[PDB]
Design a protein around this nucleic acid. Structure first.
Ligand code: MG
Ligand code: MG
Ligand code: MG
Ligand code: MG
Ligand code: MG
Ligand code: MG
Ligand code: MG
Ligand code: MG
Ligand code: MG
Ligand code: MG
Lengths: 62, 32, 205, 361
RNA sequence: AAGAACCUUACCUGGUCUUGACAUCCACGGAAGUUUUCAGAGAUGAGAAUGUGCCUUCGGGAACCGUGAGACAGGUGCUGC
RNA sequence: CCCGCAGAAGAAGCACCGGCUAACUCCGUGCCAGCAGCCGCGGUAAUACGGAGGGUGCAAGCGUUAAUCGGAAUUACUGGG
């Protein structure tokens, strides 16, 4: 299947072990799955503060 | 060519706010 | 499992005194209270249909310090019991221990009444009990243990409770530091500012 | 008070930028690494490495020593001017002018080196501009962009020759090709290749309706008549045919196009210079190889030339310009250099974007 | 546009000034104004003759010129969607 | 489970804030990034995007996804045409 990459900017490649989460976008024809940012190999987004549980960013350690 | 016939590079038409094709049911807010 | 924040900001969202900061000074004596509850609070709200029932429910929870997981569990027992489910909820919230201590004047705040209970300083029916959710049985005695005898809060709060209404379903003995829990409290006998019927409709959505 | 010293201040800060370009620290670090590897006893025992180690040496010695020549040179020119003003030696005033200029002439030597002009950047080139989609709105943008480039090179002095021009339907072309004769003509124009966005209220629809048109431009050089690697046979195809109408004073008075294709990888070139069919096919195969030549250089960039495979394909210089007419805001998407003068850059004030493209190109 | 030879003229080329052609506020000194010569396309820049009036806030206000620190001024620059 | 020993000393995060559904206006981006459950938001003046401040809802849990039922009187026997 084809899945959607959430978040702003990704770190994927020709071979990456990602984690597929259900969910339709209803904006791309045929995309009916999302990709969990911050899972197995797909890393979390960069510089994220508001909703970081979504997109797997830990916390500002400052 | 193929780097221009990509489905991105298409003539984009904007919905004008007033005039022909301007009507909105409720708009960006519906505060009542 | 507690609030642990600015006390009277909770009263500002309601617009009335919820008595959870009360000593002597009424309402800050100053700047803003019973008014704008935030930054954009000077702007009046519109109070939608859900929010009227919501702020009614939130007001009652801010009074007794009960969280939503727990308050809903009082609603389960209130609804399954006989009689008026709108009335039984305020009955079970009244029989809650920290309320009973607060109605004695043993503590000057429902938070302070938890401070005395949680730090094992109150013996209900002779037995020391540190559960703030202790539903007090009718025709029972509540008492302060000797380690809290005149320990600078009991004296200060009990003298502060002279401006109260001295609740009719109870018998406090100011000078023996021992209370007495009389009958179940009547619906008409409590605060009566609370529209209890808006609460029951909310959880029955 | 000396405005020459005001240029010495300007050249010195620019020298700090010139040092800021080349990473002057790592220049002196790497140059000593070539030094240590030549001490190795097998320099004569590794002949091919020895010519290469000297090549790595000599290429940096023309730069690092020049960087140090600009260091100790500028400090003396900083001395020779201030000594001249404070002592009033008329010849010292006259000599310091030549002392400042030669450093700029070294900055000019770094200028082509910072431009790192290699293959055919010092040579003439060809243009190739295609119209987008949506009828007349696209071809006007094909026209207005092309005729901006035509008015551009004339101010710079580059000779212009329309190799081929294919008019679309209503005031504009669908494809065009222009030969730009000039010194470093490919060097000033190479980086302009990509898609150019046009945003304007269209004059073609009643009312308004701001329309977004697209058009691309492709700049490929002159390959010195032969690359020295001929990949000619390659399913060759000739299609020479008459063109639109030769109406009155239509282009070149030729109307004799020579459509040539290169089937593998799909390369199409054409020529409309003269009636002599053998002359045009000779000239079209010249640019066919050049268009095939730019394909060979993109493959190097596709692997590890200048892409820096870090996370993914870092590049995609397709949308390199945005021309918003009704907001008078021309933005380059490769540097971020903006300009609030449409008709100036529609006349050819494109030097601000060349230096922007010189940085990343 | 109820009227482009300069002016208008906002555009082009070259020559130039930049808290400025225009306004108020600060400081210092100088009344203003009038005549005339040189370089120069002109703008300006550089000199020389000339006058110092009204009240007494008398150690200046009212006027006017020049040089600076800035606050700003200025825009016929973009958007009539 | 009781008794005794300290300075409140060791113990607060998570989603959301256009409407549905409790809760805002300022910066940065500019149909490009991105949001989404649905209606749809982003075109240089966004309450929907990305930060900040301020709130709301829950709270050692909070959200997301998967799955069943409910709203579905949209399989209606109770209860439709
Ligand atoms: Mg719990
Ligand atoms: Mg000029
Ligand atoms: Mg102004
Ligand atoms: Mg104006
Ligand atoms: Mg609301
Ligand atoms: Mg936001
Ligand atoms: Mg906050
Ligand atoms: Mg369902
Ligand atoms: Mg059913
Ligand atoms: Mg039916």
């Amino acid at each position: 299947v084809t899945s959607y990459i959430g978040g702003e900017g990704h770190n994927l490649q020709e071979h990456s072990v990602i984690l597929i989460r259900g969910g339709r976008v209803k904006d791309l024809p045929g995309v009916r799955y999302h990709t969990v940012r911050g899972a197995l190999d797909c890393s979390g987004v960069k510089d994220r503060k508001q909703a970081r549980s979504k997109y797997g960013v830990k916390r500002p350690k400052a | 060519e193929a780097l221009l016939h990509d489905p991105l590079f298409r003539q984009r038409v904007e919905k004008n706010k007033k005039g022909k094709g301007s009507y909105m049911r409720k708009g960006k807010h519906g505060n009542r | 499992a507690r609030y642990l924040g600015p006390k009277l900001k909770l009263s500002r969202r309601e617009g009335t005194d919820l008595f959870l900061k009360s000593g002597v000074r009424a309402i800050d004596t100053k700047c803003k209270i019973e008014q704008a509850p935030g930054q954009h609070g000077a702007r009046k709200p519109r109070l939608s249909d859900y929010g009227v029932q919501l702020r009614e429910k939130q007001k009652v929870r801010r009074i007794y310090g009960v969280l939503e997981r727990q308050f809903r569990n009082y609603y389960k027992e209130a609804a399954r019991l006989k009689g008026n489910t709108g009335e039984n909820l305020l009955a079970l919230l009244e029989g809650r221990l920290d309320n009973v201590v607060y109605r004695m004047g043993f503590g000057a705040t429902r938070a302070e009444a938890r401070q005395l209970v949680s730090h094992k300083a109150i013996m209900v029916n002779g037995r020391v009990v540190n559960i703030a959710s202790y539903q007090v049985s009718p025709n029972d005695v509540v008492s302060i243990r000797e380690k809290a005898k005149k320990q600078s809060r009991v004296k200060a709060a009990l003298e502060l409770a002279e401006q109260r209404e001295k609740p009719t379903w109870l018998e406090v003995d100011a000078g023996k530091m021992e209370g007495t829990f009389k009958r179940k409290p009547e619906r008409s006998d409590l605060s009566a500012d609370i529209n209890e019927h808006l609460i029951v409709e909310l959880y029955s959505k | 008070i000396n405005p020459v010293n005001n240029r010495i201040q300007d050249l010195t800060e620019r020298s700090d930028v010139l040092r800021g370009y080349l990473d002057y620290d790592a220049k002196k670090e790497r140059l000593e690494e070539v030094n240590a590897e030549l001490e190795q006893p097998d320099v004569w025992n590794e002949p091919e490495r020895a010519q290469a180690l000297g090549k790595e040496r000599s290429s940096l010695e023309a730069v690092v020593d020049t960087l140090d020549q600009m260091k100790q040179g500028l400090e003396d020119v900083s001395g020779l001017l201030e000594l001249a003003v404070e002592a009033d030696d008329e010849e010292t005033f006259n000599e310091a002018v030549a002392e400042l200029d030669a450093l700029e002439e070294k900055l000019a030597q770094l200028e082509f080196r910072r431009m790192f002009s290699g293959e055919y950047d010092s040579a003439d080139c060809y243009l190739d501009i295609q119209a987008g989609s949506g009828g007349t709105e696209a071809q006007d943008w094909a026209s207005m962009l092309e005729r901006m480039y035509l008015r551009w090179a004339e101010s710079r002095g580059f000779k212009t020759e329309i190799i081929e021009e294919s008019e679309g339907e209503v005031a504009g072309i669908k494809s065009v090709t222009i030969k730009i004769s000039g010194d470093y003509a490919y060097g000033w124009l190479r980086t302009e290749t990509g898609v150019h966005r046009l945003v304007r209220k269209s004059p073609f629809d009643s009312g308004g309706r701001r329309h977004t048109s697209f058009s691309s431009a492709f700049v490929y050089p002159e390959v010195d008549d032969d690359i020295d690697i001929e990949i000619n046979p390659a399913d060759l195809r000739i299609d020479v045919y008459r063109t639109s109408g030769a109406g009155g004073q239509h282009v070149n008075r030729t109307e004799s196009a020579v459509r040539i294709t290169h089937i593998p990888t799909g390369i199409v070139t054409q020529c409309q210079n003269d009636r002599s069919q053998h002359k045009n096919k000779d000239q079209a195969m010249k640019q066919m190889k050049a268009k095939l030549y730019e394909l060979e250089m993109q493959k190097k960039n596709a692997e590890k030339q200048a892409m820096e495979d870090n996370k993914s394909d870092i590049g995609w210089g397709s949308q390199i310009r945005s021309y918003v007419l009704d907001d008078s805001r021309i933005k380059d998407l490769r540097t971020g250099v903006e300009t609030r003068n449409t008709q100036a850059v529609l006349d050819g004030s494109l030097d601000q974007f060349i230096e922007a493209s010189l940085k990343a190109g």
